[PDB]
Design a protein around this ligand. Structure first.
Ligand SMILES: [Cl-]
Ligand SMILES: [Cl-]
Ligand SMILES: [Cl-]
Ligand SMILES: [Cl-]
Ligand SMILES: [Cl-]
Ligand SMILES: [Cl-]
Ligand SMILES: [Cl-]
Ligand SMILES: [Cl-]
Ligand SMILES: [Cl-]
Ligand SMILES: [Cl-]
Ligand SMILES: [Cl-]
Ligand SMILES: [Cl-]
Ligand SMILES: [Cl-]
Ligand SMILES: [Cl-]
Ligand SMILES: [Cl-]
Ligand SMILES: [Cl-]
Ligand SMILES: [Cl-]
Ligand SMILES: [Cl-]
Ligand SMILES: [Cl-]
Ligand SMILES: [Cl-]
Ligand SMILES: [Cl-]
Ligand SMILES: [Cl-]
Ligand SMILES: [Cl-]
Ligand SMILES: [Cl-]
Ligand SMILES: [Cl-]
Ligand SMILES: [Cl-]
Ligand SMILES: [Cl-]
Ligand SMILES: [Cl-]
Ligand SMILES: [Cl-]
Ligand SMILES: [Cl-]
Ligand SMILES: [Cl-]
Ligand SMILES: [Cl-]
Ligand SMILES: [Cl-]
Ligand SMILES: [Cl-]
Ligand SMILES: [Cl-]
Ligand SMILES: [Cl-]
Ligand SMILES: [Cl-]
Ligand SMILES: [Cl-]
Ligand SMILES: [Cl-]
Ligand SMILES: [Cl-]
Ligand SMILES: [Cl-]
Ligand SMILES: [Cl-]
Ligand SMILES: [Cl-]
Ligand SMILES: [Cl-]
Ligand SMILES: [Cl-]
Ligand SMILES: [Cl-]
Ligand SMILES: [Cl-]
Ligand SMILES: [Cl-]
Ligand SMILES: [Cl-]
Ligand SMILES: [Cl-]
Ligand SMILES: [Cl-]
Ligand SMILES: [Cl-]
Ligand SMILES: [Cl-]
Ligand SMILES: [Fe+2]
Ligand SMILES: [Fe+2]
Ligand SMILES: [Fe+2]
Ligand SMILES: [Fe+2]
Ligand SMILES: [Fe+2]
Ligand SMILES: [Fe+2]
Ligand SMILES: [Fe+2]
Ligand SMILES: [Fe+2]
Ligand SMILES: [Fe+2]
Ligand SMILES: [Fe+2]
Ligand SMILES: [Fe+2]
Ligand SMILES: [Fe+2]
Ligand SMILES: [Fe+2]
Ligand SMILES: [Fe+2]
Ligand SMILES: [Fe+2]
Ligand SMILES: [Fe+2]
Ligand SMILES: [Mg+2]
Ligand SMILES: [Mg+2]
Ligand SMILES: [Mg+2]
Ligand SMILES: [Mg+2]
Ligand SMILES: [Mg+2]
Ligand SMILES: [Mg+2]
Ligand SMILES: [Mg+2]
Ligand SMILES: [Mg+2]
Ligand SMILES: [Mg+2]
Ligand SMILES: [Mg+2]
Ligand SMILES: [Mg+2]
Ligand SMILES: [Mg+2]
Ligand SMILES: [Mg+2]
Ligand SMILES: [Mg+2]
Lengths: 172, 172, 172, 172
């Protein structure tokens, strides 16, 4: 056993490794989305910048979980990072919708992890999830929802003008 | 009853007084360790500085619990502060090992206190412990573990050179 | 066809997608190595910092290739990022040796890509590889070689003192 | 022979004179486009500014080739600068499309020049073209492509509103 390990269930250790993979997957999804908007036939530079930033934020989320694993005396086990479900993201609206779905999926995983930490009476792990993950998820979901709403109301995806103006005035 | 008291169980009040004593005990252990390294026949000034700082930090932990007791309308009851288990701490490695054991013991007490606060549905007390104690404990335990590891790998306690170089490059 | 595409062979486009995957793989290898050194039973913080920096640099290498793909009118196609070959990296010396092997493998791929670009008379792609990749690879390989040499001469991996002192004086 | 001349083929010298003319022609095309947008019945001041800047950049491209000719000991021979193919550029979208076509034509000429320099084993000339011309061309082509895409998606050229808003938010 690790000399630092205390009140850290093997199930929690495994669940943290699963979450590390999911955060890295989210980073990869946003990386793919970003460069879609950098295509010469899409050409929305602020969509590209927004998603690239989100990609880097997800890598930080993964790194903090790796730090947590070691802090508690668990051992990191990495798996393949799956490619994103799409190569072509269709439109600014469709990418925002996919990002919303992604964030809600990652949120569900975090809630299941918190439930496990509660079941195993691990208040340090509960606090870690609450402090560093749960409100960040709620804010990200709300922001993406707001963006989807704007784009729909402006007439996307059929209006290329709508996506252009949203790119300039909200993401720029 | 105190005019401020609300949702604060007598058992929680007693457990807080027990924790105050334990934090003061930890302060005393680190004070003893510090001056061991200030001995002319030990002479590791950065070990001495490190443990003196830890001693002062533990006094702050005790003071914050005393503040909490009064905030919630409980009444502070103090007990003797027991002398540390050792007069002679043997080596830098042995002191670090004793500090690791101490921090894990104090952590166990904090986890039992959190379990009591949960059992009595006292979310303010739960949050207090999580916010101000539990991650500080996890960080301290990880740091001490890292230090023990370094010292062992460098050849302590038999290598006086190892302890000297660790004193200079990690604690200095 | 893309409106921007000119003198860009389909084979080159495919080879660039292969290189993007390899750079992301290299980023993942260094991420794994970094947190190995953050383990409480390894505890070499400057090895950890060094490899984390290298991980972030590899992500920038991948991003620049994604930018290139779009600049030339090719289309990005992403694949799974394979997990690193090892979970446990053994020692500072062994990790440096694995990093050296990794960088030489990535270099070989870049040289094959340059040979393809030469075969297809694509001087823009040749210049891109030379300017942004080939000397960076040569410098990284030389640095890792120097590090391996130091560690061996100092007595690693058997000397935990050697790895500690290298961590402090070269990587710190 | 020039006292400085070394490894500089007569064919390369002639090809450089041809490129000088083409760069001056490109400068003239952009000058014409610029003042089209300054017409009172067109009135898009940021299109005008953008193309005037591009015109001045092309003159710098020509000047650098003239400097190169003398550096290598060749002799500059100038020809008439042909007037642009159009007097009336129709719309912001049409001008951007013509600029894209122009840049791809100039790129093709640069690639033919690089092929000649390769055939004559003139690595200095190869490096000159790669360093100062080929990536500038790729970037210009990508930028113009992005602009064409935006304008089409926004509803140009039929939407005078689209061209107005693009003028303000992308070129302004
Ligand atoms: Cl335990
Ligand atoms: Cl445990
Ligand atoms: Cl367990
Ligand atoms: Cl696992
Ligand atoms: Cl997984
Ligand atoms: Cl896997
Ligand atoms: Cl699978
Ligand atoms: Cl359970
Ligand atoms: Cl709990
Ligand atoms: Cl949060
Ligand atoms: Cl919000
Ligand atoms: Cl908030
Ligand atoms: Cl919004
Ligand atoms: Cl009450
Ligand atoms: Cl009460
Ligand atoms: Cl009570
Ligand atoms: Cl009491
Ligand atoms: Cl007591
Ligand atoms: Cl007493
Ligand atoms: Cl007693
Ligand atoms: Cl109870
Ligand atoms: Cl509660
Ligand atoms: Cl804390
Ligand atoms: Cl820590
Ligand atoms: Cl932390
Ligand atoms: Cl340490
Ligand atoms: Cl072509
Ligand atoms: Cl082509
Ligand atoms: Cl082809
Ligand atoms: Cl491909
Ligand atoms: Cl691949
Ligand atoms: Cl795949
Ligand atoms: Cl496979
Ligand atoms: Cl070929
Ligand atoms: Cl070539
Ligand atoms: Cl380079
Ligand atoms: Cl070097
Ligand atoms: Cl160099
Ligand atoms: Cl070195
Ligand atoms: Cl010659
Ligand atoms: Cl000559
Ligand atoms: Cl000749
Ligand atoms: Cl001529
Ligand atoms: Cl001519
Ligand atoms: Cl003429
Ligand atoms: Cl003529
Ligand atoms: Cl020839
Ligand atoms: Cl050559
Ligand atoms: Cl260039
Ligand atoms: Cl570009
Ligand atoms: Cl570039
Ligand atoms: Cl654009
Ligand atoms: Cl507007
Ligand atoms: Fe974000
Ligand atoms: Fe951010
Ligand atoms: Fe995340
Ligand atoms: Fe997220
Ligand atoms: Fe401390
Ligand atoms: Fe402190
Ligand atoms: Fe404490
Ligand atoms: Fe403590
Ligand atoms: Fe590097
Ligand atoms: Fe760097
Ligand atoms: Fe790389
Ligand atoms: Fe590399
Ligand atoms: Fe330009
Ligand atoms: Fe310029
Ligand atoms: Fe030019
Ligand atoms: Fe040009
Ligand atoms: Mg998963
Ligand atoms: Mg698959
Ligand atoms: Mg709670
Ligand atoms: Mg909290
Ligand atoms: Mg918070
Ligand atoms: Mg007690
Ligand atoms: Mg006694
Ligand atoms: Mg906290
Ligand atoms: Mg591959
Ligand atoms: Mg596998
Ligand atoms: Mg260079
Ligand atoms: Mg000509
Ligand atoms: Mg004529
Ligand atoms: Mg260059």
């Amino acid at each position: 056993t690790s000399q630092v390990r205390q009140n850290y269930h093997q199930d929690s250790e495994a669940a943290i490794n699963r979450q590390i993979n999911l955060e890295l997957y989210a980073s990869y999804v946003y990386l793919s989305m970003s460069y879609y908007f950098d295509r010469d036939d899409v050409a929305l530079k602020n969509f590209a910048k927004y998603f690239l930033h989100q990609s880097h934020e997800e890598r930080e989320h993964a790194e903090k979980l790796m730090k947590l694993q070691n802090q508690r005396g668990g051992r990191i086990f990495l798996q393949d990072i799956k490619k994103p479900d799409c190569d072509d993201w269709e439109s600014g609206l469709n990418a925002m919708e996919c990002a919303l779905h992604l964030e809600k999926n990652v949120n569900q995983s975090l809630l299941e992890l918190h439930k496990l930490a509660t079941d195993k009476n691990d208040p340090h792990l509960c606090d870690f999830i609450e402090t560093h993950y749960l409100n960040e998820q709620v804010k990200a979901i709300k922001e993406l929802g707001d963006h989807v709403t704007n784009l729909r109301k402006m007439g996307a995806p059929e209006s290329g003008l709508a996506e252009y103006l949203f790119d300039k005035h909200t993401l720029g």
